[PDB]
Design a protein around this nucleic acid. Structure first.
Ligand SMILES: NCCC[C@H](N)CC(=O)NCCC[C@H](N)CC(=O)NCCC[C@H](N)CC(=O)N[C@@H]1[C@H](O)[C@@H](OC(N)=O)[C@@H](CO)O[C@H]1NC1=N[C@@H]2C(=O)NC[C@@H](O)[C@H]2N1
Lengths: 79, 86, 207, 82
RNA sequence: UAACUGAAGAGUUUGAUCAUGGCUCAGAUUGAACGCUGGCGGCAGGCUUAACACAUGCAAGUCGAGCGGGGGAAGGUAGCUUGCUACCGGACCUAGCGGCGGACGGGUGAGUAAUGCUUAGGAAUCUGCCUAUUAGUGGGGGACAACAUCUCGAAAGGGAUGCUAAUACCGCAUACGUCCUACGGGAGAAAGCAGGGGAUCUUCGGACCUUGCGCUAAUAGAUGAGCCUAAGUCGGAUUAGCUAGUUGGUGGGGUAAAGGCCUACCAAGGCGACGAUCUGUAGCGGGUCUGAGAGGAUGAUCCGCCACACUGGGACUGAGACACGGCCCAGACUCCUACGGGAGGCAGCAGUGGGGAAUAUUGGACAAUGGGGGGAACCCUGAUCCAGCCAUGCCGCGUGUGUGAAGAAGGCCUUAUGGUUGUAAAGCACUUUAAGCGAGGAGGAGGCUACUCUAGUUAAUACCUAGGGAUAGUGGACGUUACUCGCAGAAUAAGCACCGGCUAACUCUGUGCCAGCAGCCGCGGUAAUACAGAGGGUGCGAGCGUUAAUCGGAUUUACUGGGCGUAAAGCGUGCGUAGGCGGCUUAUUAAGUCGGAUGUGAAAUCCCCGAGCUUAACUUGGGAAUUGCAUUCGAUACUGGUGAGCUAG
């Protein structure tokens, strides 16, 4: 019963943190053509398991730092 | 202040401020003594300082000078730091 | 407000009898200027008219018959358009449902103006209360009567005598002995005279 | 505290009250938690004079709401009528 | 049943014409303003500009049943210059300490493009008064206002010494819960007051019993608040790079609580063409106006959220404030002064000056609904309910009705005696709406006190609490109310714009490119239907016109719904980055797409059916709607992802 998201890791340099890029497809409000929107989320990786290019699942949690409020659940696909 | 009750509130505010400041400074002093003993590093001295400090923190927390969550935090953290000295 | 002034020139301009006078004498003998407009530049009815002129002149005739001013008439049109059914039929039913018109068609008033005067002066009771508003809508089953103080008035006897000559309407059931009638239902368009082309008023307001 | 009181609606000299559950600090005609009936002191003809939802009234009273004096009187009247 | 059903064109480029393309007009709407005119009622609205400066009054108090003092009226007994004096027991009042309130209610939109708002979720929190439940309320101590004395100052207000009460303050004791714990243990509260009473004692005046209001520790509920996440939320590239507590981690600090919130180290991270940074403008939403719809404009009055309180920076008290009518500091300004010293913040209500095209009374009552205090009686409340002013808007009503011609007079026109004003007027006969005078008269008031009885708790019939009954008092600002019944008399009541075409309504005099009119095309240079007056008419009507502003017509930024040979419009031509789109077959996935269910989408507003206002406006019951968002379960044709295969590109 927790909010999860699936995305691609685009950064793993910092300690215990990954940058996941989420993608969604929405309709333009007036012109009606489906377009692509992307958001960047900072997640928490306790053991630095995730790497650049993997497909990961993250879930909402209590804040861990200034910008991190999501935690890694599992690595669906490895680069 | 324009009204008599407002003036009375200001007077009571000053008096309560002095009293609360006294009690709060007492709490700070006892915590500082415990920290000084911990820095000294003797286990028995630190234990004695902590045992002296705890009742003051509890009494002032009960009077409302500090929150009981604050008192619990101080007690737990100081106890852990004392235990670290073995 | 309320129009006060010469009645017959209005009929002359409209080109038809508007029942503004009681009707003791015919309109032709009463005016002697029928078939001509009231202006010094007045002509016969055969002159050319634009569509706007026709639409305007149709609405003015109905307004002058019923004594209704422009704002109230526009409100009547809006209500008729909101209500489902034929818009012209709804408008004509709304006009005929007015209390002052119902009193006139009862015959206590020789003219709609006289009926309105009676209603305003509280000589008429709806159901059992002395109202004084001419524009009150009369519903099915309502009972209209004459107040006791207003009974025994030579104008009322003259009006009922003239109403005897006039065709008694079907939808209203009135006893003249005690001076009281019942509104049974709204008149139908077929019951109403056919010289009125309500479609012209409809196209006028629909623009 | 939570109270049950009347919120004034209607027009000039013809008030119409809604019976509402609300925090007592809110404005009389402003924010409220729940509406549980109405009161019309000058009703006539077919107009309903008082309507109160007894189930929600009892629920809020058990939760701790404090009815005003007029609302308590209206609740007594509604209980007598029903 | 019902909840909608909706789309008009015209004028103007030319000697004709068709097209293109601007400009202008017919509509709806307004917190409007101005000009002319002006009778009444109901319901609403009323500084949009200077978040400019403010005289004066009011807008926050209450509790003696928490406490000690201090007052001034009635009584009684004793003496007597005899109706005067001395003391004594009750009833009242409150400057001070103390409790609660003052963080609500009320005002404004300056700041704020996201620390805000809208929708949908979440975890690491606190929460006075209210409800339920559990364990208690034992015993001491030292002070300080008032008061007394001194002293400064005209005062206002200051400063210094000596006392005193408490539900003010601090130890000690005890601890069902509670906090810490190394799981052995350790730590921490509180206050009394009031009503009544059988028996007993009374060390002499209470103990004792009982019932309320209180106080302490804790767990739930309810309410309120704090924090976090995702999506959405106005322009500018003639602003392209921005950031070093900056991004992450560890130890420590800090908070009610997560967190660079803070700090010391370690690393080099973090944001940006899906617009970072900088910069202009702006409170946001429910809603409002317009539009067939899609869209566009807007955010007064009502409701929710946020922010601010002369301008900036802080903290105290408190459950809660970084506090409109509280404190400290700095700044500008204003006021009193006896030169010693002091005082202030209307964007609260009313009001003043100023600004402006323009927006009201220095009113009444707490009777009703609420809010604060109190056990209650009751007190406070510019919230509120009412009243005053204004045609500002909407709705309703009146200013009379019928008859009356061999067609009076007068006016205007004339082919000169007719036509028009016109049934119009006079005359005759009726009526009393509204306004005026007089007389009656609801409802907005549920209740409270007194009396009686019942049932609870108790030792009790007392007290307290909860109910019932009848009777009598008591309680309304509005207010001379709404409404009803009488009285006299047509008596008190009609204006404004326009008449060349667009666009309904035409002539005569005066003037002659003058005076003037004009939204556009255009009128006026002697017969002007276009200027001014008159007659007549037309459209509205207590209103009528003008100016300003928004949408529409405008398919004139074209998503719905336009164009680029010559009317405006294909880059001078290639290559190519990001991006957009992409051949055929097959398996799989379920992101796009589609369907179901659940939760939510506040109320008010719009629409429908009813109800009450003499009708209508207006008020109101219930629906419908809120076209959205989220979660979850399904479908697999098409698009996308993945695997395999193919040859027409
Ligand atoms: N401390 C407050 C400072 C407020 C502000 N930060 C500065 C300010 O207003 N300074 C003025 C200023 O010094 C002077 O006045 C002029 N005009 O120069 C002075 C005349 O005495 O008054 C002060 N203002 C004052 N307001 C006060 C008041 O009412 N009572 C007490 C006293 O503080 C008074 N002085």
């Amino acid at each position: 019963t927790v909010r999860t998201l699936t995305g691609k890791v685009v950064s793993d340099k910092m300690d215990k943190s990954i940058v996941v890029l989420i993608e969604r497809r929405v309709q333009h409000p007036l012109y009606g053509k489906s377009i692509r929107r992307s958001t960047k989320l900072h997640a928490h990786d306790e053991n630095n398991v995730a790497k650049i290019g993997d497909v990961v699942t993250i879930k909402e949690s209590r804040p861990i730092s200034k910008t991190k409020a999501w935690t890694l659940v599992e690595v669906v696909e490895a680069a | 202040a324009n009204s008599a009750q407002a003036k009375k509130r200001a007077r009571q505010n000053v008096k309560a401020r002095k009293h609360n400041a006294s009690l709060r400074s007492m709490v700070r002093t006892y915590i500082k003594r415990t920290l000084s003993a911990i820095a000294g590093g003797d286990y028995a001295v630190a234990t004695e300082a902590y045992k002296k400090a705890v009742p003051v923190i509890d009494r002032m927390a009960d009077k409302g000078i500090i929150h009981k969550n604050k008192a619990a935090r101080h007690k737990s953290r100081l106890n852990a730091q004392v235990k670290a000295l073995a | 407000a309320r129009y006060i002034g010469p009645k017959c020139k209005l009929s002359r301009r409209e080109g038809t009898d508007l029942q503004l006078k009681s009707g003791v004498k015919p309109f032709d003998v009463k005016t002697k200027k029928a078939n001509k407009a009231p202006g010094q530049h007045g002509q016969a009815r055969g002159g050319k008219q634009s569509e706007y002129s026709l639409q305007l002149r149709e609405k003015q005739k109905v307004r002058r018959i019923y004594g209704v001013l422009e704002r109230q008439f526009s409100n009547y049109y809006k209500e008729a358009a909101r209500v489902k059914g034929a818009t012209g039929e709804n408008l004509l039913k709304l006009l005929e449902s007015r209390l002052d018109n119902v009193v006139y068609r009862m015959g206590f008033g020789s003219t709609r103006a006289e009926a309105r005067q009676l209603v305003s002066h509280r000589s008429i009771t709806l159901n059992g209360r002395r109202v004084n508003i001419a524009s009150i809508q009369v519903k099915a089953g309502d009972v209209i009567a004459v107040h006791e103080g207003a009974k025994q008035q030579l104008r009322i006897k003259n009006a009922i005598e003239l109403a005897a000559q006039r065709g008694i309407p079907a939808w209203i059931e009135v006893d003249h002995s005690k001076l009281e009638g019942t509104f049974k239902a709204a008149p139908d368009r077929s019951d109403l005279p056919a010289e009125i082309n309500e479609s012209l008023i409809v196209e006028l307001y629909s623009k | 505290m939570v109270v049950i009181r009347l919120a004034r609606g209607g027009a000039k000299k013809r008030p119409f009250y809604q019976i509402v559950v609300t925090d007592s600090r809110n404005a009389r005609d402003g924010r409220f938690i729940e509406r549980i009936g109405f009161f019309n002191p000058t009703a006539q003809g077919q107009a309903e004079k008082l309507r109160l939802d007894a189930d929600r009234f009892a629920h809020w009273v058990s939760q701790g709401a404090q009815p005003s004096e007029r609302v308590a009187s209206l609740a007594a009247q509604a209980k007598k009528a029903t």
